[PDB]
Design a binder for this molecule. Structure first.
Ligand SMILES: [Ca+2]
Ligand SMILES: [Ca+2]
Lengths: 572, 598
């Protein structure tokens, strides 16, 4: 592979970095803005609306060699629990590869679709792993590299930086405090998170907000990630209040890298029973789920166990378990707050790629820019003996569907918390396969009502073996949909096996793109559209893009937010 | 990017001048795993009969060309594991574009042979619509003054050198006359005369006596001369085309010819729909005894219709065992009762030492003694073990049994036994039909992990008691987080084990999750030479002369890395850029000292 790569810098490389001189820079730009105004659920009675959750995840295993816009690899870190996350930190950086590292565009897009701000990484490594004081001194030069950090974030389109100083005086310490204050003064409406490590004298992790580290939070940073070795956080909460700062800008670190759900934690020291606070929660390396597994299925099973709990139901969490799950303390958030809302249950990778329920490529692929907004609840069912999981065997658009299967001798599955204003012309649409001939009803919940309305669709269409129902919602114009769900009824078979490959609320074709065959060993550039597809006549899908370009008789189409394709621009 | 040895394939004129000693790939294509004799059959299914045989026509490799000789760094590969319901395997391959004479690849011959299943190569004369040429048929049918057929000799030479058990002959090329037909019959008779004992020649029901392609779907007067002609044996068996409703008249005609009706294999085409294939089972298995044997066309549907190893394996279970998921309890009223409904499972666990590590033939990772020695995807079906006779038979609990590719002791897989088991509740899983003589110094060993601290007991059945004996081990060892038990069987010397099982008890947790990575009842450092592999100048081969397989490790900054495995006499390595370590593992998986190669 010789295509564009996600960026990473040593301080002296960054200082002379310019987008216009960097052939990979345009491929590393995100074109999916941060979704504002997420809406929270209320399924878990224990969950509080005070604490936030930061995730420090190695969304790419390595700093270097990361393709800008996806790769032909099924097993990739397709993290799907954005709904329990308030802030994502791209975990990366090393002495051998580069210490300043922005998130890759594919991951920025996925984060942004879910309304989660994502931060780049500034990592001053420990000296035992090749860390150098020089790099720290270079970054702290005063009269430029803070300006450069802010430039990278603006150009690539991410939301700030995580600063992690781990390289082993007071002059340097004070210069760091000035660097951080400078950032605060110069940043846009952006987050700067600092790791609890270097103290006032210049490395002594406090595991709390204390006198030694308080000057790193006039004000100097948006938050602090607290080191792991604590038993109680009340002191940090009290001191934060004394400083006139929210205790919830403090993120009490938990190291889950090695053991994940088997990590021992003193939860009561962070979440006192029948009590508020003490602080927010910082997760170090939840990508445990991915790095400790060999297969997509096991990876996804572990993420469920980690974020939801052993119950497998976000509404019925067990707070006395060794791992109650993140759903036990944190409301799920949803970016399904705008019409049109459209999902195809795309997990961000596949063993195959489908268009209208037909395989258009048999190759493995990942492109997290194509990951949809996935269900708020994993999983809430009523009735029957059924399991809900993602399937990479069947897909309507992309590489995955939602599978709902098992025994059914009435059953419902509640999928989405939403905030969708209904107007005339708005319709509900959904597309599924059924192996035992059972129909699949849609469910929708209206604001001011606590029960879902389950109905059969009005108009049925058959698309390559898939059934697509349409349900006009003109009768509820002026109302707001607050939930989405499905329902089914058992037949003589006694079995149910559904694959659902799309779900949408709204209505609607984009113009053929002006595509220019250009040099990188090629680069297509084109300038309402969800993503672009590049077919090859043999038709075979050879590329997808959510940006303004792709590196590869060709046919290029723009798909709208509703997934209506444009006429294909032919190119030779 | 692969520039190493490839599995062979030929057009008739390429075969004609083929010589093993000149072919750089030939030594890589030799199977070094002999056909296991004397399989033992189970009796779990009351309906199953012992008369009918089953032939499988499987595309064990999706393509004819580009098939690496000894495996590849690819997890998703056709790792067929229902050898136990198969009597004969036909390697499905050949095309007008790639080659029409195609032997099975060595990895697939090994796996077949480990399970006591004869495996046949393919000779495919394609329909003219798909590039078929009468010339190819005419070339194969060339005859010396001798009366000999030089290309028949070549078929026998290939089978002998590569070590497989015969040929499937499929004549689908239109435009042949009665003279061609008689020459084909003479070619087939010549094979019967010259073949080694035990070699099998199967003929497709296609070209009739006139030369015309008119599939009969039965044994009839139009095709009988391709099986038997008076007292002349023409072929060992016939694969009957798909369009039949009843086979009684085939059975009757076979008897009139003095041949077993079970040398006739009634074709069922399952390529597109697998378990959803409509079949008139009654027309084959009536009321008494089966009319004929069964021919399954493309059961590799399970692989080719799936995207992932897990769904592939689930489909094979549904296909071969049926919707019950229990070979002992099939549903004969189902549209698909499964193969276990009619066929006894056979086992080759008939010899001490019997050793398995539940290696499915591929993995996402490779382990040695419970530690990952390579994180790369791999397949090498030469390493596929003899897997459980029964998929699956359990008693008690709420457990599921499946293969896991997340955990492994040796190779890329383990047997996962997991779910709910309430405190004090007992559960058993019966795995193997066996025939293992116990003598002094014989022991049972098994290696597992338990995620909720339940112990795993072994089960063994003695001839011919009906109950399994469930006992805890006696000597425990901890190996990289895995527990290995040893149970001496000196107390039962002179007895024969006829089955193997496992058992567990539920604890306070109410949950059980086992991964079992070895089960067993029961070398010198390899002399290694670095040799040129002529077609690839930047490549090498290691050649050496008791041993299950060889493992090739290379030194890294991160510890030893597994870079190759071989069940033959050699291995090809691309781009060797280096210190290598080659060990021989015994049948008991005792490793030799490593031979160091620079
Ligand atoms: Ca595929
Ligand atoms: Ca792996």
């Amino acid at each position: 592979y010789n295509g564009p790569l996600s960026s990473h810098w040593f301080p002296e490389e960054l200082a002379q970095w310019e987008p216009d001189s960097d052939p990979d820079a345009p491929f590393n730009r995100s074109h999916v803005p941060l979704e504002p105004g997420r809406v929270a659920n209320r399924v878990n009675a224990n969950a509080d609306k005070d604490a936030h959750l930061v995730s420090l995840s190695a969304l790419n295993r390595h700093t270097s060699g990361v393709p800008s816009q996806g790769a032909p690899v099924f097993y990739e870190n397709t993290f799907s629990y954005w709904h329990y996350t308030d802030l994502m930190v791209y975990w990366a950086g090393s002495a051998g590869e580069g210490i300043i590292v922005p998130p890759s565009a594919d991951v920025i897009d996925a984060s942004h679709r879910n309304g989660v701000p994502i931060l780049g990484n500034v990592f001053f490594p420990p000296t035992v792993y090749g860390g150098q004081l020089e790099w720290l001194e270079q970054m702290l030069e005063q009269e430029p590299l803070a300006d450069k950090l802010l430039e990278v974030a603006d150009y690539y389109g991410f939301d700030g930086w995580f600063i992690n100083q781990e390289t082993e005086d007071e002059g340097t310490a004070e210069a760091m405090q000035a660097f951080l204050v400078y950032l605060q003064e110069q940043k846009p409406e952006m987050h700067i998170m600092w790791y609890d490590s270097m103290i006032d004298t210049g490395i002594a992790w406090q595991n709390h907000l204390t006198d030694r580290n308080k000057m790193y939070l006039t004000r100097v940073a948006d938050s602090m990630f607290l080191n792991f070795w604590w038993r109680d956080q009340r002191q940090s909460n009290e001191l934060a209040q004394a400083l006139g700062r929210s205790p919830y800008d403090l993120y009490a670190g938990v190291d889950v890298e090695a053991r994940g759900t088997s990590t021992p934690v003193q939860w009561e020291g962070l979440f006192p029973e029948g009590e508020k606070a003490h602080t927010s929660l910082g997760l170090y390396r939840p990508d445990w789920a991915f790095q400790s597994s060999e297969t997509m299925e096991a990876f996804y099973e572990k993420e469920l166990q980690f974020w939801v709990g052993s119950t497998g139901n976000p509404a019925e969490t067990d707070g006395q378990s060794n791992w109650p799950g993140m759903a036990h303390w944190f409301p799920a958030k949803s970016t399904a707050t705008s019409v049109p809302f459209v999902t195809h249950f795309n997990t961000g990778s596949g063993a195959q790629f489908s268009a209208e329920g037909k395989t258009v490529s048999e190759q493995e692929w990942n492109n997290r820019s194509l990951q949809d907004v996935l269900p708020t609840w994993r999983w809430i069912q009523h009735g029957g003996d059924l399991e809900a999981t993602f399937s990479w065997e069947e897909a309507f658009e992309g590489g995955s569907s939602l599978q709902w299967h098992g025994s059914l001798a009435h059953a419902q599955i509640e999928l989405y918390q939403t905030e969708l204003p209904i107007s005339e012309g708005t319709s509900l649409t959904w597309t599924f396969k059924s192996e035992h001939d059972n129909d699949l009803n849609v469910g929708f919940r209206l604001d001011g009502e606590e029960d879902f309305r389950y109905v059969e669709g009005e108009q049925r269409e058959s698309i390559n073996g898939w059934t697509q129902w349409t349900l006009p919602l003109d009768a509820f114009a002026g109302q707001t949909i607050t939930g989405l769900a499905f329902a089914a009824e058992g037949n003589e078979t006694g079995l149910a096996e559904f694959y659902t490959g799309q779900l949408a609320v709204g209505a609607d074709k984009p113009a053929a793109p002006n595509v220019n065959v250009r040099q990188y060993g090629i680069q297509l550039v084109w300038e309402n559209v969800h993503h672009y597809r590049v077919y090859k006549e043999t038709k075979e899908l050879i590329g997808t893009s959510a940006g303004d370009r792709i590196y590869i008789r060709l046919h290029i189409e723009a798909l709208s937010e509703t997934f209506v394709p444009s006429d294909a621009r032919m190119i030779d």
